[PDB]
Design an enzyme around this catalytic site. Structure first.
Site, PDB file in Angstrom:
ATOM      1  N   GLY A   1       0.892  -1.163  -0.165  1.00 10.07           N
ATOM      2  CA  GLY A   1       0.114   0.089  -0.036  1.00 10.07           C
ATOM      3  C   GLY A   1       0.596   1.252  -0.132  1.00 10.07           C
ATOM      4  O   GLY A   1       1.945   1.236   0.274  1.00 10.07           O
ATOM      5  N   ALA A   2       0.089   2.378  -0.386  1.00  9.24           N
ATOM      6  CA  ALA A   2       0.639   3.729  -0.551  1.00  9.24           C
ATOM      7  C   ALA A   2      -0.043   4.661   0.587  1.00  9.24           C
ATOM      8  O   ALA A   2       0.082   5.819   0.415  1.00  9.24           O
ATOM      9  CB  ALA A   2       0.716   4.000  -2.018  1.00  9.24           C
ATOM     10  N   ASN A   3      -0.745   4.042   1.397  1.00 15.00           N
ATOM     11  CA  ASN A   3      -1.576   4.591   2.570  1.00 15.00           C
ATOM     12  C   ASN A   3      -2.658   5.557   1.773  1.00 15.00           C
ATOM     13  O   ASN A   3      -3.081   6.678   2.120  1.00 15.00           O
ATOM     14  CB  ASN A   3      -0.868   5.429   3.607  1.00 15.00           C
ATOM     15  CG  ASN A   3      -0.572   4.324   4.901  1.00 15.00           C
ATOM     16  OD1 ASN A   3      -1.487   3.699   5.426  1.00 15.00           O
ATOM     17  ND2 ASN A   3       0.770   4.475   5.058  1.00 15.00           N
TER      18      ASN A   3
ATOM     19  N   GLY B   1      -6.471   5.225  -0.649  1.00 17.49           N
ATOM     20  CA  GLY B   1      -7.896   4.910  -0.547  1.00 17.49           C
ATOM     21  C   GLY B   1      -7.927   3.632  -1.361  1.00 17.49           C
ATOM     22  O   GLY B   1      -8.535   2.523  -0.830  1.00 17.49           O
TER      23      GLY B   1
ATOM     24  N   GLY C   1      -5.615   1.061  -1.665  1.00 19.60           N
ATOM     25  CA  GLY C   1      -5.359  -0.065  -0.839  1.00 19.60           C
ATOM     26  C   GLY C   1      -6.116  -0.398   0.106  1.00 19.60           C
ATOM     27  O   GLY C   1      -6.479  -1.400   0.883  1.00 19.60           O
TER      28      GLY C   1
ATOM     29  N   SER D   1      -2.806   0.418 -15.121  1.00 21.53           N
ATOM     30  CA  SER D   1      -3.569   1.603 -15.282  1.00 21.53           C
ATOM     31  C   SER D   1      -3.828   1.717 -16.868  1.00 21.53           C
ATOM     32  O   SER D   1      -2.900   1.440 -17.615  1.00 21.53           O
ATOM     33  CB  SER D   1      -2.592   2.780 -14.912  1.00 21.53           C
ATOM     34  OG  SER D   1      -3.183   4.220 -15.368  1.00 21.53           O
TER      35      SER D   1
ATOM     36  N   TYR E   1       5.502   7.341 -15.556  1.00 23.02           N
ATOM     37  CA  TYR E   1       4.402   6.403 -14.945  1.00 23.02           C
ATOM     38  C   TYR E   1       3.903   5.424 -15.902  1.00 23.02           C
ATOM     39  O   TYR E   1       3.716   4.170 -15.633  1.00 23.02           O
ATOM     40  CB  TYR E   1       3.070   7.320 -14.762  1.00 23.02           C
ATOM     41  CG  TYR E   1       1.827   6.625 -13.870  1.00 23.02           C
ATOM     42  CD1 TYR E   1       2.313   6.120 -12.692  1.00 23.02           C
ATOM     43  CD2 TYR E   1       0.769   6.674 -14.450  1.00 23.02           C
ATOM     44  CE1 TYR E   1       1.250   5.516 -12.091  1.00 23.02           C
ATOM     45  CE2 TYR E   1      -0.188   5.890 -13.587  1.00 23.02           C
ATOM     46  CZ  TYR E   1      -0.217   5.216 -12.555  1.00 23.02           C
ATOM     47  OH  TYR E   1      -0.920   4.481 -11.986  1.00 23.02           O
TER      48      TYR E   1
END
Length: 268
Positions: free
Chosen positions: A20-22, A24, A26, A136, A162
């Protein structure tokens, strides 16, 4: 009507590792699997923030430290996982300024692809079901630059960096599945993408997480890619990908480069 997280099957007694990237996406993915009885291990850089969120989630969401921008941290985290059923490579950063990781990687390819590549190879011997990697729509304009993956000698583009990483996530998934099949493994490698939220354009996190949750739970052929029917929005289903994402030679070459950069290898 389309599939939603309301349709998730039981995950009782099953262990799911989620990077996770803290953010939403995740958090919702963890929340919904824990509500269905999963033992969830959320692997995050900022464990104080992670624990403050996890401690009020119904079910079992444990927080452990993982810094995907530090291969030594990836190794320490992996060595602490005794076994898991599902690995979800969810953490990402998106369209940030040029920066290097501890290991000298450009931060987007380093975080989104290389750290996940190393993590997956280190966990594979102790995984029982599947790897789900989150990509993505931004993969479509992406291109793999094998000579200069880390943008050392070419002008940086936040969005094309990206896109390179998101394309890498798909090529990773295809080549991982090819290797699993060749090894006679029952494991599957799958991918998902969240639609509009992770593109150059509570509710957003639910919609994005839905896609991952379908890939984590449904009986899908290896190398399936799941997302909204119309890319940005639409019902959750298997979807298509770019011509460059279907290049098997590039998937195999990228794998070799990734093994060299990360000092990890396919272990089965």
């Amino acid at each position: 009507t389309g599939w939603t997280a309301a349709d998730l099957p039981s995950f009782a007694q099953r262990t799911v590792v989620i990077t996770g990237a803290n953010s939403g996406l995740g958090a919702v993915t963890a929340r919904e699997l824990a509500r269905r009885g999963a033992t969830v291990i959320m692997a995050v850089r900022d464990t104080r923030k992670g624990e403050a969120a996890a401690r009020t989630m119904a079910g079992q969401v444990e927080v452990r430290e993982l810094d995907l921008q530090d291969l030594s941290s990836v190794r320490r985290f992996a060595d602490g996982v005794s076994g898991a059923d599902v690995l979800i490579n969810n953490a990402g950063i998106m369209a940030v300024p040029y920066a290097l990781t501890v290991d000298g990687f450009e931060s987007q390819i380093g975080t989104n692809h290389l750290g996940h590549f190393a993590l997956t190879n280190l966990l594979l011997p102790r995984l029982t079901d599947r790897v789900v990697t989150v990509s993505s729509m931004a993969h479509w304009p992406g291109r793999i630059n094998l000579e200069d993956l880390n943008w050392r000698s070419r002008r940086y583009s936040p969005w094309l960096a990206y896109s390179q990483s998101k394309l890498a996530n798909l090529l990773f998934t295809s080549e991982l599945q090819r290797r699993l099949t060749a090894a006679g493994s029952p494991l599957r490698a799958l991918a998902a993408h969240p639609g509009y939220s992770h593109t150059n354009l509570a509710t957003d996190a639910d919609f994005g997480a839905r896609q991952t949750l379908y890939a984590a739970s449904q009986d899908l052929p290896g190398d399936s890619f799941v997302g909204p029917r119309f890319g940005y929005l639409g019902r959750t289903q298997p979807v298509g990908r770019s011509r460059r994402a279907k290049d098997a030679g590039m998937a195999a070459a990228l794998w070799a480069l990734s093994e060299q950069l990360t000092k990890t290898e396919f272990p089965l």
